[PDB]
Amino acid sequence: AERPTLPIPDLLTTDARNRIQLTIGAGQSTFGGKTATTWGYNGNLLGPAVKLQRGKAVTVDIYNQLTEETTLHWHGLEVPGEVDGGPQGIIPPGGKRSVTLNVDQPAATCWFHPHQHGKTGRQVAMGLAGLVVIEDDEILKLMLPKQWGIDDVPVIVQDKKFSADGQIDYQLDVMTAAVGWFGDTLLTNGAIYPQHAAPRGWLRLRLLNGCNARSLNFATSDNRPLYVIASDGGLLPEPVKVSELPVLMGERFEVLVEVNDNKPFDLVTLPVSQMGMAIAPFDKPHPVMRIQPIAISASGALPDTLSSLPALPSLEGLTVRKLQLSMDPMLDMMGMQMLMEKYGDQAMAGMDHHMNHGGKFDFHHANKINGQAFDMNKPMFAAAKGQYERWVISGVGDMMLHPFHIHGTQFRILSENGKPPAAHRAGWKDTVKVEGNVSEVLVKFNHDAPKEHAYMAHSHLLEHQDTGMMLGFTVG
Ligand SMILES: [Cu+2]
Ligand SMILES: [Cu+2]
Ligand SMILES: [Cu+2]
Ligand SMILES: [O]
């Protein structure tokens, strides 16, 4: 069989009432010829790409047609807490909530997904995620590849695992609360190993790691380079050439890659050094999509300069906030031993060389920040508005991967896990790696968040977030 074409999310803009309609519902998808119940926005799986323009407001009407509560968070978008869609932004089953987004940040590829309390991992695993394309006046003057679905394509990469009857097999239990939910099947915009036909010249890929727990590392099958032009929060100052591109859960990068006649190539993901993530078929480079060149000229450019990146300010006198992540040692050991028992030594490939005792021992609140599992009723602190702060996030104490995400901002990384950030990670970010070490980021919050609709800060390894590794904070 030929490969299926890469599905392209619809690019959605407002109506004359300046509204975008999103319906959240359950439907059916097919994977490897077996049907599965899946959830989507405006469809059965995944979602559209909502297009936003800096300095323009849009209203989004969100209809929850599931039979359980959900929320909708705009990951990467800087909006007041009242419309941020964290766990307090409940949408009742069968109900509607509307939000007005006043877009006030540079061009970037952001995304949106559920943030239901304690259930975010399951609702993402069932299929809910969408995209956000922010444009501004500056980016259009660059004349980047811009034909949506032709030379400008989103690539949402996610793993799933399925039970024998075809259904998605999601369980939040001691082992996945320890190591994360991961599977053996890789999806690219919902499809297994699709092909994308691209014109000759530059192809722009907007990459999103939409996995619950798996980190990825993109490369090409014939070692042609990727030119990074943008990170989570928008353009870099100039392109950064890379041979491989690590992407943590919830992160985005946009890259340009050359397309040459007669020479198809794959986008692949290379094995990572993360517990559990190098079990077959991920013990070897794994294709994500085939790029099929078409002998029609692509008109996009890769300019020498993309944007201006301001200097870091002086750090003296800035408020320093400490965020100590932690896991329960007993439950970490129990979950890691179940992983080893199931898959054996391969569950640590690439790494450096039973009774009920009550609620005190419940894994659902085993993961914590500053000694507390997420308490929706008690924001941990009140951050300053319009002031830079230095947030120091420590994973010392365990060796699991914590891609740490802060709502309400695009920050600058000062230290990523004990080293200055790589050049393609030195621009605007909303995620920073923490793994066995300490990171420090420079953040500023331009919008208010009250206690009733607080901003979240958490690990984007969803099973850890859902089992307590999140805090709430207010701004203003
Ligand atoms: Cu997110
Ligand atoms: Cu977010
Ligand atoms: Cu979040
Ligand atoms: O998130």
Side-chain angles (χ1 to χ4, degrees):
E2 290 191 39
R3 298 183 177 91
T5 55
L6 177 69
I8 306 298
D10 287 348
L11 187 65
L12 303 184
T13 53
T14 51
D15 60 21
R17 298 161 11 80
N18 199 42
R19 303 178 89 70
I20 292 155
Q21 185 179 269
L22 294 175
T23 295
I24 317 176
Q28 294 291 304
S29 301
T30 298
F31 302 106
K34 186 86 193 173
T35 193
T37 302
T38 56
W39 296 0
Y41 299 110
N42 292 2
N44 295 314
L45 182 61
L46 291 169
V50 169
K51 188 178 189 190
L52 301 175
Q53 181 82 21
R54 188 181 191 157
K56 297 179 136 191
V58 305
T59 297
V60 185
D61 291 324
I62 306 159
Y63 297 89
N64 180 8
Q65 300 185 350
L66 307 170
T67 63
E68 68 173 82
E69 284 176 356
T70 189
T71 79
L72 194 161
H73 171 58
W74 307 92
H75 182 141
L77 191 76
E78 305 163 9
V79 298
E82 297 88 327
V83 293
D84 183 60
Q88 294 162 295
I90 60 182
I91 314 174
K96 177 197 193 189
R97 292 291 190 272
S98 300
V99 296
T100 294
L101 306 180
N102 292 272
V103 184
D104 175 44
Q105 70 192 84
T109 304
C110 293
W111 65 301
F112 60 92
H113 63 74
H115 228 299
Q116 184 64 17
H117 190 201
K119 303 186 167 70
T120 294
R122 176 161 182 269
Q123 299 197 343
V124 173
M126 289 298 294
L128 293 177
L131 292 168
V132 179
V133 172
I134 309 171
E135 283 184 0
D136 63 15
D137 284 352
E138 290 60 28
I139 195 163
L140 299 185
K141 295 173 192 132
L142 294 178
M143 306 301 303
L144 294 170
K146 70 168 181 289
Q147 297 294 347
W148 185 258
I150 299 181
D151 64 359
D152 178 12
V153 324
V155 186
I156 303 165
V157 178
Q158 302 178 293
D159 60 335
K160 293 191 196 304
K161 59 158 161 187
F162 297 93
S163 37
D165 68 357
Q167 303 301 325
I168 295 167
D169 180 12
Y170 186 88
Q171 65 279 120
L172 177 60
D173 56 17
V174 171
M175 186 182 97
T176 66
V179 308
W181 188 70
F182 66 87
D184 63 356
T185 301
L186 198 66
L187 304 180
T188 308
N189 296 354
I192 296 173
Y193 193 13
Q195 66 177 311
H196 180 68
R200 178 205 306 131
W202 289 119
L203 168 61
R204 178 180 184 182
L205 305 182
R206 306 179 183 244
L207 300 166
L208 167 60
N209 180 346
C211 297
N212 280 38
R214 173 182 298 282
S215 60
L216 298 170
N217 180 5
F218 289 109
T220 62
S221 58
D222 60 5
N223 311 312
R224 67 186 68 206
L226 300 178
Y227 295 89
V228 189
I229 60 160
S231 55
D232 304 325
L235 294 166
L236 299 179
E238 67 186 346
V240 177
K241 188 181 173 180
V242 305
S243 59
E244 44 183 78
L245 181 56
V247 185
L248 305 175
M249 298 79 87
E251 280 192 334
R252 291 84 57 212
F253 287 95
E254 301 182 40
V255 301
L256 268 58
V257 62
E258 175 174 359
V259 179
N260 297 115
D261 289 358
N262 297 322
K263 188 145 201 192
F265 60 96
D266 291 332
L267 182 68
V268 308
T269 181
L270 304 180
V272 304
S273 297
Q274 185 186 349
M275 189 166 70
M277 299 309 162
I279 298 150
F282 290 106
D283 63 321
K284 306 208 156 218
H286 193 295
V288 173
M289 53 183 269
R290 185 143 289 192
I291 294 82
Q292 289 284 353
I294 297 305
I296 298 172
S297 179
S299 347
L302 182 65
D304 284 1
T305 309
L306 301 164
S307 65
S308 190
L309 191 66
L312 295 181
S314 182
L315 302 180
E316 159 64 6
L318 300 178
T319 302
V320 172
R321 304 200 190 270
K322 178 196 101 197
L323 294 71
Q324 176 68 65
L325 312 178
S326 67
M327 299 177 74
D328 178 66
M330 179 267 278
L331 265 16
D332 205 5
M333 186 192 331
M334 277 176 37
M336 306 192 353
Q337 173 181 319
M338 302 173 79
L339 182 75
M340 296 314 287
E341 286 177 354
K342 180 159 165 17
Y343 299 104
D345 299 329
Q346 190 68 30
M348 297 274 285
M351 298 305 289
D352 148 273
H353 184 250
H354 79 273
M355 299 301 290
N356 189 347
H357 297 289
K360 146 172 191 353
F361 294 103
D362 182 337
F363 69 88
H364 288 90
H365 311 276
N367 295 308
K368 302 173 176 88
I369 308 183
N370 291 342
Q372 324 186 246
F374 178 59
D375 188 342
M376 199 169 70
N377 297 153
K378 199 176 162 343
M380 181 167 301
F381 55 76
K385 178 164 184 211
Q387 309 299 323
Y388 289 113
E389 303 186 341
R390 298 152 71 182
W391 289 20
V392 174
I393 308 105
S394 177
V396 175
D398 63 74
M399 300 285 315
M400 299 294 103
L401 172 66
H402 313 296
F404 196 75
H405 171 55
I406 302 166
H407 291 205
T409 190
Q410 289 290 337
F411 54 67
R412 305 291 300 283
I413 299 176
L414 303 181
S415 182
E416 181 151 42
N417 210 46
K419 284 167 246 286
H424 64 289
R425 299 175 66 83
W428 299 108
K429 292 293 276 85
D430 61 42
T431 306
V432 61
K433 179 173 171 181
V434 178
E435 185 185 305
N437 207 300
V438 180
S439 293
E440 177 174 4
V441 302
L442 177 79
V443 58
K444 175 179 289 192
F445 305 102
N446 299 321
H447 310 277
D448 293 329
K451 168 175 110 147
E452 292 81 9
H453 295 287
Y455 284 138
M456 301 296 104
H458 54 88
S459 173
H460 214 288
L461 194 161
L462 296 182
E463 287 60 50
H464 291 170
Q465 181 193 307
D466 279 340
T467 54
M469 194 173 288
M470 178 156 76
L471 58 81
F473 65 97
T474 59
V475 170

